[PDB]
Amino acid sequence: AIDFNDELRNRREKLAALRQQGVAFPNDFRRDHTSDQLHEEFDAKDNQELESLNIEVSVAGRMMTRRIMGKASFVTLQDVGGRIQLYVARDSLPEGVYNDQFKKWDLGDIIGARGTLFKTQTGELSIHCTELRLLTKALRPLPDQEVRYRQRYLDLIANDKSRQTFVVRSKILAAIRQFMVARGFMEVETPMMQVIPGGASARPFITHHNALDLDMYLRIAPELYLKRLVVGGFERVFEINRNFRNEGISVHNPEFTMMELYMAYADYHDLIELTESLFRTLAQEVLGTTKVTYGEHVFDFGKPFEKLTMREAIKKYRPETDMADLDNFDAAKALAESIGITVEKSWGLGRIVTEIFDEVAEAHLIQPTFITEYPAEVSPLARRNDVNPEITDRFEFFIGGREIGNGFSELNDAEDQAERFQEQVNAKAAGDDEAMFYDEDYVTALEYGLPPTAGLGIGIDRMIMLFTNSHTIRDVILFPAMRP
Amino acid sequence: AIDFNDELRNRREKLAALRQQGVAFPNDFRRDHTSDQLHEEFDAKDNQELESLNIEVSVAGRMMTRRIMGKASFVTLQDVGGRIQLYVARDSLPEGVYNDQFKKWDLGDIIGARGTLFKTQTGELSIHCTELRLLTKALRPLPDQEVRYRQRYLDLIANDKSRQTFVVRSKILAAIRQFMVARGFMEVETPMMQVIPGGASARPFITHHNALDLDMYLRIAPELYLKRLVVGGFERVFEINRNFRNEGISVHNPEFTMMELYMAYADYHDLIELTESLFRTLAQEVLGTTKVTYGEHVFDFGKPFEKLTMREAIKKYRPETDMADLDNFDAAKALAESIGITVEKSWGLGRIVTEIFDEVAEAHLIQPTFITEYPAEVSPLARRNDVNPEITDRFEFFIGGREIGNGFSELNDAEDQAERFQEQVNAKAAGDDEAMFYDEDYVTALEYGLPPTAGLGIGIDRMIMLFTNSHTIRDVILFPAMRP
Ligand SMILES: N[C@@H](CCCC[NH3+])C(=O)O
Ligand SMILES: N[C@@H](CCCC[NH3+])C(=O)O
């Protein structure tokens, strides 16, 4: 209780002493090795080898543990690559350093060490220090469960598993890029600020551009811009970046990372194949196996995902459903309301059926699953099905009961797109706050001619969860949006 | 004039006919080669070789030119990789296709072709088509100078040089990532929406989070978050993404791409070296040479950048300056005002001197140049110089008379950081609308201990300009913010 306030006072006082001696915060020590490198190269060597090799190295990091035993001490130093042992002895260091400096430092302090590699009696790799310095005085001791999110730096210092999660996120993004580029896709950057938001249905964030006296929107999706690029001739493009949806912070984050990709002369079937390869590749290359453990489940990304139509999923998860009800507006509305769905005045049959699917099946799609036949009403940007114009060549895919991706054969029929935008404008007029805005320039782009194309959006944060056994999106986002 | 309205009517009518025949917009044709691949592999082969090799391929793209000559025609097809010639003959295609379909198509139409490779009498690589299809009817004919920005898709269809510019941008970003990762840097993602904006000085964009009834800011820089990651132990991190500054759209874009990188146990000198290697590497790997032509200049990224202190730059570009004036507030204010700078009440000597440097020297820094010794007043996040506390270990670097990067040894002195934040709060109270907000959590992070570190921000859009001979930032941003 009070012992903490003493740690603080003690560290301040030690800092005051440093200031009196000269420059309290230097920037001069240079390391030439991180712990992981030392382990990779030297863990397999016994003390006899290291003795003859006589390898001197320099490391730096946070002093995590210290056991002072008179004339000698043992320190665990934690850097970007993990931890390495330091053997700190009075007579190995320059005169006075051990007793007048080292012993006065505190756990949490950033230190630098140079010395010779060897192995302890316990067989651990260690550095027999010949030089040791205090680089940064830590004014605070080493560290609900919200603290992890409000002070992620404390989470990263303390928890090896949190660190590994974020290192894996970076490995996954790099591997996605490598996967995409190998398939001839080119990464592009489209606006975050848009005059007309689109490419999805969501309440947007609005901001005022002080200069051009205009109201701008943070993007809910880059879709309409990416398809303009395909019209332009960039027939294989992808973008990995944020979308912003003014929903709630219900562990949901207002901003999240999405990858969208478009490939001309392909349909949704090609996206299905690409999705399966991507997951199999990521699992194999990043995790070492195609069988991934997530909670109480195992996902085999080496086997094809399940494929069901939206109606098959509804029937499978609410077997008592009279499927004929989904063909009649009144019946579908009644069914929807009976399962707790508030049916808005603007909704049509296709929207109601989709909402029923969400309520009924989504949570149960645990194993990787593609759900096809999304109604036209809820897919204003998707190609109509040749046989039944009321459904589109669109799928969403789910893993662990969450939506991971959304893909479709793109609507390249400009006149149809205009009509569908108009319907969305009518829906907003009828109360649909999330309906799409009419985008004339986008229609114009389609009039110049969009090649037949397939596009896919994949929630990167959700994907990261599945590969790191995280069960809240907040565990894979470095700095989650936190309530004040 | 009226001939355009006829093109439109004609294309609509042809589309109407397509609709009557069946599905006007199919998604079925699959290609197996792009033009660039065909050229790479087959340009060096003469007609004798191609005749015996008898290689059949499938391509698809926009019909750019067509010369109909009775029973045979020549078409230029433009895809993602460039252009390839098609030889379209009545008797080579299935019955009726040539006369009843092909001849009725229009330039701009997206078409698919399968056929055998050969070389024309002119020595050009061409495809003797055996199958040809209309994939997408173009309802509009092929395309101030603002149109390029308002309809970038038209710019990309029409101008090979615009395309190449954006292909190079993507190559540069990929090469930057490859350069960074090779040096042990890990790419991370920090928030675009922040409760407290910081890491730079600029008027921000504000947006309301409908849910959490809170006002949020689009980030002006990710700096404060990235340094929290270094405290956390991610000692080599970088982020490449947008910043948003509510300035003007004076060809300046409200949102732009920046790379920020941080490396612990390094100072600004290491950033200088990294900057030089990065540019030399990018030029060599992407452009094929270290000597880069930009406008009327040539930049040799194979030779060290020039290095001048801020004062040396002022003296060099306004030689008549009595340098002693920069040591006296009144004198400096008078000097500043005499060159047209409006000196605000909140400004101190360091700010005035920096403003003088901007007015006097910035535009003249054509050859790659580092400018050191930035005053403390204008560098609230930078490490103080050991000898003179009123300047910081900070530099900015310029090329082509524009600021390309900003880097410094990081301030890891928590108590100093708090004081400097307080000064920034005072500056805002005194009228500085762009002054930094006090960030308590950031100070707390520094109290846990930030290793000595060097950080650098590089304007990616400006960098792209220098490598593509573009002279407005709008030429390297796919969809520039355009006035309504
Ligand atoms: N824009 C979609 C992803 C791409 C769908 C195919 N065009 C979304 O935000 O869900
Ligand atoms: N945050 C700086 C770049 C990094 C400077 C070094 N910490 C900027 O926006 O200019």
mmCIF file of C-alpha atoms in Angstrom, chain A residues 12 15 19 23 25-27 29-31 60-62 78-80 108 110 135-143 150-151 153-154 156-157 163 166-167 169-170 173 177 186-193 205-212 214 216 218-219 225 228-229 231-236 239 241-242 244 246-249 254-255 257 265-267 270 383 386 409 412-416 441 444-445 447-454 478-479 481 484, chain B residues 12 15 19 23 25-27 29-31 60-62 78-80 108 110 135-143 150-151 153-154 156-157 163 166-167 169-170 173 177 186-193 205-212 214 216 218-219 225 228-229 231-236 239 241-242 244 246-249 254-255 257 265-267 270 383 386 409 412-416 441 444-445 447-454 478-479 481 484:
data_model
loop_
_atom_site.group_PDB
_atom_site.id
_atom_site.type_symbol
_atom_site.label_atom_id
_atom_site.label_comp_id
_atom_site.label_asym_id
_atom_site.label_seq_id
_atom_site.Cartn_x
_atom_site.Cartn_y
_atom_site.Cartn_z
ATOM 1 C CA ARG A 12 12.721 10.025 -7.942
ATOM 2 C CA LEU A 15 17.001 10.238 -10.556
ATOM 3 C CA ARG A 19 20.885 14.740 -12.586
ATOM 4 C CA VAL A 23 23.232 13.912 -18.018
ATOM 5 C CA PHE A 25 19.183 10.416 -19.707
ATOM 6 C CA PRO A 26 22.017 9.531 -22.122
ATOM 7 C CA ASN A 27 21.643 8.168 -25.654
ATOM 8 C CA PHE A 29 25.058 2.833 -25.630
ATOM 9 C CA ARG A 30 24.856 0.635 -28.719
ATOM 10 C CA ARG A 31 24.016 -3.047 -28.711
ATOM 11 C CA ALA A 60 20.346 -3.724 -23.794
ATOM 12 C CA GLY A 61 16.901 -3.965 -22.300
ATOM 13 C CA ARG A 62 14.774 -3.852 -19.174
ATOM 14 C CA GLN A 78 14.380 -8.450 -21.324
ATOM 15 C CA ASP A 79 14.678 -6.965 -24.824
ATOM 16 C CA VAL A 80 12.665 -7.071 -28.060
ATOM 17 C CA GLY A 108 12.405 -1.872 -14.582
ATOM 18 C CA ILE A 110 16.734 0.092 -18.883
ATOM 19 C CA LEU A 135 20.416 3.917 -19.733
ATOM 20 C CA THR A 136 16.956 4.908 -18.504
ATOM 21 C CA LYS A 137 15.859 5.214 -14.877
ATOM 22 C CA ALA A 138 12.381 3.693 -14.481
ATOM 23 C CA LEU A 139 10.446 6.044 -12.197
ATOM 24 C CA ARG A 140 7.783 3.368 -11.703
ATOM 25 C CA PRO A 141 8.139 -0.290 -10.586
ATOM 26 C CA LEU A 142 7.440 -3.139 -13.002
ATOM 27 C CA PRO A 143 3.698 -3.871 -13.420
ATOM 28 C CA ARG A 150 -5.640 1.350 -21.046
ATOM 29 C CA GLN A 151 -1.895 0.805 -20.594
ATOM 30 C CA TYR A 153 2.732 -0.993 -22.560
ATOM 31 C CA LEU A 154 2.325 -2.575 -19.123
ATOM 32 C CA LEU A 156 3.540 -5.953 -23.142
ATOM 33 C CA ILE A 157 6.218 -5.615 -20.439
ATOM 34 C CA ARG A 163 3.676 -9.820 -26.915
ATOM 35 C CA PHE A 166 1.093 -8.929 -31.518
ATOM 36 C CA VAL A 167 4.238 -10.382 -33.029
ATOM 37 C CA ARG A 169 -0.378 -10.275 -35.933
ATOM 38 C CA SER A 170 2.572 -8.633 -37.714
ATOM 39 C CA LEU A 173 -0.080 -9.253 -42.170
ATOM 40 C CA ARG A 177 0.950 -9.379 -48.347
ATOM 41 C CA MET A 186 -1.005 -4.788 -56.194
ATOM 42 C CA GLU A 187 -1.536 -2.967 -52.938
ATOM 43 C CA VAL A 188 -3.106 0.473 -53.239
ATOM 44 C CA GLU A 189 -4.257 3.268 -50.934
ATOM 45 C CA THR A 190 -7.671 4.889 -51.270
ATOM 46 C CA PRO A 191 -9.152 7.766 -49.161
ATOM 47 C CA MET A 192 -10.064 7.452 -45.470
ATOM 48 C CA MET A 193 -11.992 10.718 -45.788
ATOM 49 C CA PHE A 205 -18.321 9.123 -38.442
ATOM 50 C CA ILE A 206 -18.653 12.648 -39.826
ATOM 51 C CA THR A 207 -15.998 15.348 -39.534
ATOM 52 C CA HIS A 208 -15.853 18.939 -40.750
ATOM 53 C CA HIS A 209 -13.029 19.977 -43.081
ATOM 54 C CA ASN A 210 -12.367 23.471 -41.647
ATOM 55 C CA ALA A 211 -10.772 24.750 -44.883
ATOM 56 C CA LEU A 212 -13.149 23.658 -47.678
ATOM 57 C CA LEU A 214 -17.370 20.743 -46.252
ATOM 58 C CA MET A 216 -16.594 14.691 -44.773
ATOM 59 C CA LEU A 218 -14.572 8.590 -42.359
ATOM 60 C CA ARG A 219 -14.830 5.612 -44.699
ATOM 61 C CA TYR A 225 -12.844 3.435 -54.918
ATOM 62 C CA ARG A 228 -12.804 2.494 -59.928
ATOM 63 C CA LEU A 229 -9.202 1.288 -59.972
ATOM 64 C CA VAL A 231 -12.134 0.200 -64.355
ATOM 65 C CA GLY A 232 -8.851 2.104 -64.635
ATOM 66 C CA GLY A 233 -7.011 -1.124 -65.462
ATOM 67 C CA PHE A 234 -5.527 -2.184 -62.110
ATOM 68 C CA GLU A 235 -7.253 -5.527 -62.493
ATOM 69 C CA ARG A 236 -5.775 -7.148 -59.356
ATOM 70 C CA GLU A 239 -5.928 -2.627 -49.715
ATOM 71 C CA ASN A 241 -6.390 -0.585 -43.778
ATOM 72 C CA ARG A 242 -8.988 0.830 -41.359
ATOM 73 C CA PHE A 244 -14.705 3.298 -39.269
ATOM 74 C CA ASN A 246 -20.038 4.521 -35.692
ATOM 75 C CA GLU A 247 -21.543 1.525 -33.878
ATOM 76 C CA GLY A 248 -20.935 0.697 -30.207
ATOM 77 C CA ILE A 249 -17.796 -0.267 -28.251
ATOM 78 C CA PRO A 254 -15.247 1.683 -33.845
ATOM 79 C CA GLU A 255 -12.215 1.338 -36.130
ATOM 80 C CA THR A 257 -8.645 -3.348 -40.139
ATOM 81 C CA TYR A 265 -12.205 -12.011 -64.838
ATOM 82 C CA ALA A 266 -13.160 -14.031 -61.747
ATOM 83 C CA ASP A 267 -16.347 -14.765 -59.804
ATOM 84 C CA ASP A 270 -12.541 -17.918 -57.241
ATOM 85 C CA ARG A 383 -23.960 -9.211 -59.282
ATOM 86 C CA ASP A 386 -28.546 -15.450 -63.497
ATOM 87 C CA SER A 409 -19.111 -11.332 -58.046
ATOM 88 C CA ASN A 412 -20.767 -4.230 -63.335
ATOM 89 C CA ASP A 413 -24.222 -3.346 -64.707
ATOM 90 C CA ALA A 414 -24.250 0.476 -64.400
ATOM 91 C CA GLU A 415 -27.989 0.879 -65.016
ATOM 92 C CA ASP A 416 -28.780 -1.779 -62.391
ATOM 93 C CA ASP A 441 -19.442 9.292 -60.144
ATOM 94 C CA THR A 444 -20.270 6.942 -64.311
ATOM 95 C CA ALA A 445 -17.181 4.785 -63.701
ATOM 96 C CA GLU A 447 -20.564 3.277 -67.585
ATOM 97 C CA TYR A 448 -16.953 3.320 -68.796
ATOM 98 C CA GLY A 449 -16.922 -0.416 -68.152
ATOM 99 C CA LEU A 450 -15.908 -2.546 -65.181
ATOM 100 C CA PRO A 451 -14.566 -5.947 -66.285
ATOM 101 C CA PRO A 452 -16.443 -8.885 -64.747
ATOM 102 C CA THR A 453 -14.807 -8.976 -61.296
ATOM 103 C CA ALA A 454 -14.859 -10.728 -57.897
ATOM 104 C CA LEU A 478 -2.824 -2.812 -29.748
ATOM 105 C CA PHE A 479 -4.799 0.175 -28.485
ATOM 106 C CA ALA A 481 -10.963 2.196 -28.029
ATOM 107 C CA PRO A 484 -13.614 7.352 -20.851
ATOM 108 C CA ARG B 12 -27.306 2.014 -74.870
ATOM 109 C CA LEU B 15 -26.803 -2.970 -74.546
ATOM 110 C CA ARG B 19 -30.357 -7.800 -72.674
ATOM 111 C CA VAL B 23 -27.512 -12.150 -69.728
ATOM 112 C CA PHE B 25 -23.242 -8.876 -68.145
ATOM 113 C CA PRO B 26 -21.693 -12.361 -67.828
ATOM 114 C CA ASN B 27 -18.912 -13.398 -65.449
ATOM 115 C CA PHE B 29 -14.480 -15.888 -69.229
ATOM 116 C CA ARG B 30 -11.158 -16.800 -67.633
ATOM 117 C CA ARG B 31 -7.775 -15.654 -68.860
ATOM 118 C CA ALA B 60 -8.916 -10.180 -71.473
ATOM 119 C CA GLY B 61 -8.997 -6.423 -71.278
ATOM 120 C CA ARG B 62 -10.230 -3.185 -72.796
ATOM 121 C CA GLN B 78 -5.141 -3.270 -72.894
ATOM 122 C CA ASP B 79 -4.996 -5.197 -69.606
ATOM 123 C CA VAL B 80 -3.305 -4.769 -66.216
ATOM 124 C CA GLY B 108 -13.746 0.702 -74.572
ATOM 125 C CA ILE B 110 -14.090 -5.234 -72.178
ATOM 126 C CA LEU B 135 -17.526 -9.306 -71.446
ATOM 127 C CA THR B 136 -18.595 -5.779 -70.506
ATOM 128 C CA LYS B 137 -20.322 -3.271 -72.782
ATOM 129 C CA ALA B 138 -18.778 0.180 -72.252
ATOM 130 C CA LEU B 139 -21.675 2.648 -72.222
ATOM 131 C CA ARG B 140 -19.220 5.531 -72.617
ATOM 132 C CA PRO B 141 -16.456 6.077 -75.227
ATOM 133 C CA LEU B 142 -12.791 5.968 -74.232
ATOM 134 C CA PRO B 143 -11.577 9.221 -72.603
ATOM 135 C CA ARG B 150 -12.038 13.772 -60.287
ATOM 136 C CA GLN B 151 -12.120 10.664 -62.492
ATOM 137 C CA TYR B 153 -10.126 5.859 -63.696
ATOM 138 C CA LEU B 154 -10.146 7.868 -66.928
ATOM 139 C CA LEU B 156 -5.508 5.409 -65.711
ATOM 140 C CA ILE B 157 -7.245 4.132 -68.865
ATOM 141 C CA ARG B 163 -0.429 4.075 -64.434
ATOM 142 C CA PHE B 166 1.014 4.321 -59.286
ATOM 143 C CA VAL B 167 2.651 1.005 -60.065
ATOM 144 C CA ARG B 169 4.270 3.886 -55.726
ATOM 145 C CA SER B 170 3.268 0.303 -54.877
ATOM 146 C CA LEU B 173 6.009 0.833 -50.464
ATOM 147 C CA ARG B 177 8.678 -2.729 -46.058
ATOM 148 C CA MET B 186 8.136 -4.830 -37.016
ATOM 149 C CA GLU B 187 5.154 -3.149 -38.590
ATOM 150 C CA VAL B 188 2.356 -2.232 -36.198
ATOM 151 C CA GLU B 189 -1.027 -0.506 -36.332
ATOM 152 C CA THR B 190 -1.993 2.241 -33.899
ATOM 153 C CA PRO B 191 -5.333 4.171 -33.700
ATOM 154 C CA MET B 192 -6.549 6.607 -36.373
ATOM 155 C CA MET B 193 -9.148 7.855 -33.887
ATOM 156 C CA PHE B 205 -10.243 16.855 -37.679
ATOM 157 C CA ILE B 206 -12.776 16.185 -34.923
ATOM 158 C CA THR B 207 -15.590 13.644 -35.139
ATOM 159 C CA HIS B 208 -18.302 12.613 -32.695
ATOM 160 C CA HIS B 209 -18.514 8.969 -31.614
ATOM 161 C CA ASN B 210 -22.331 8.623 -31.537
ATOM 162 C CA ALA B 211 -22.245 5.668 -29.106
ATOM 163 C CA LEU B 212 -19.823 6.714 -26.332
ATOM 164 C CA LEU B 214 -17.398 11.420 -26.899
ATOM 165 C CA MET B 216 -12.685 11.998 -31.006
ATOM 166 C CA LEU B 218 -8.456 11.866 -36.412
ATOM 167 C CA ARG B 219 -4.751 11.407 -35.722
ATOM 168 C CA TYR B 225 1.401 5.467 -29.400
ATOM 169 C CA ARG B 228 4.399 3.380 -25.844
ATOM 170 C CA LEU B 229 5.137 0.258 -27.878
ATOM 171 C CA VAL B 231 8.295 1.120 -23.603
ATOM 172 C CA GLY B 232 6.378 -2.145 -23.976
ATOM 173 C CA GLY B 233 9.444 -3.810 -25.499
ATOM 174 C CA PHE B 234 8.802 -3.590 -29.254
ATOM 175 C CA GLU B 235 12.139 -1.853 -29.642
ATOM 176 C CA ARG B 236 12.094 -1.661 -33.465
ATOM 177 C CA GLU B 239 3.903 2.139 -39.112
ATOM 178 C CA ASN B 241 -0.439 4.887 -42.748
ATOM 179 C CA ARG B 242 -2.487 8.106 -42.943
ATOM 180 C CA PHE B 244 -5.027 13.871 -41.080
ATOM 181 C CA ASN B 246 -7.127 20.061 -41.099
ATOM 182 C CA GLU B 247 -5.070 22.506 -43.177
ATOM 183 C CA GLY B 248 -5.969 23.625 -46.709
ATOM 184 C CA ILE B 249 -6.262 21.751 -50.027
ATOM 185 C CA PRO B 254 -5.859 16.857 -45.846
ATOM 186 C CA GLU B 255 -4.871 13.193 -45.487
ATOM 187 C CA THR B 257 0.699 8.764 -45.853
ATOM 188 C CA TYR B 265 19.462 2.266 -28.433
ATOM 189 C CA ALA B 266 20.039 4.663 -31.342
ATOM 190 C CA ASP B 267 20.181 8.433 -31.828
ATOM 191 C CA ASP B 270 21.523 6.453 -36.856
ATOM 192 C CA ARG B 383 15.741 14.899 -26.579
ATOM 193 C CA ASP B 386 23.613 17.861 -23.938
ATOM 194 C CA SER B 409 16.623 11.305 -30.560
ATOM 195 C CA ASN B 412 12.698 9.770 -22.598
ATOM 196 C CA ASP B 413 12.842 12.186 -19.642
ATOM 197 C CA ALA B 414 9.285 11.939 -18.232
ATOM 198 C CA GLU B 415 9.565 14.985 -15.960
ATOM 199 C CA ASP B 416 10.898 17.103 -18.844
ATOM 200 C CA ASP B 441 -0.938 8.523 -19.896
ATOM 201 C CA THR B 444 3.047 7.724 -17.240
ATOM 202 C CA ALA B 445 4.409 5.444 -19.981
ATOM 203 C CA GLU B 447 7.774 6.969 -16.088
ATOM 204 C CA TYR B 448 7.894 3.206 -16.663
ATOM 205 C CA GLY B 449 10.964 3.849 -18.793
ATOM 206 C CA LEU B 450 11.493 4.441 -22.502
ATOM 207 C CA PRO B 451 14.884 3.122 -23.663
ATOM 208 C CA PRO B 452 17.046 5.776 -25.338
ATOM 209 C CA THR B 453 15.477 5.801 -28.821
ATOM 210 C CA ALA B 454 15.590 7.492 -32.249
ATOM 211 C CA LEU B 478 -4.840 7.949 -56.378
ATOM 212 C CA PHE B 479 -7.865 9.947 -55.248
ATOM 213 C CA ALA B 481 -9.255 15.458 -52.088
ATOM 214 C CA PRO B 484 -16.703 20.373 -54.430
#
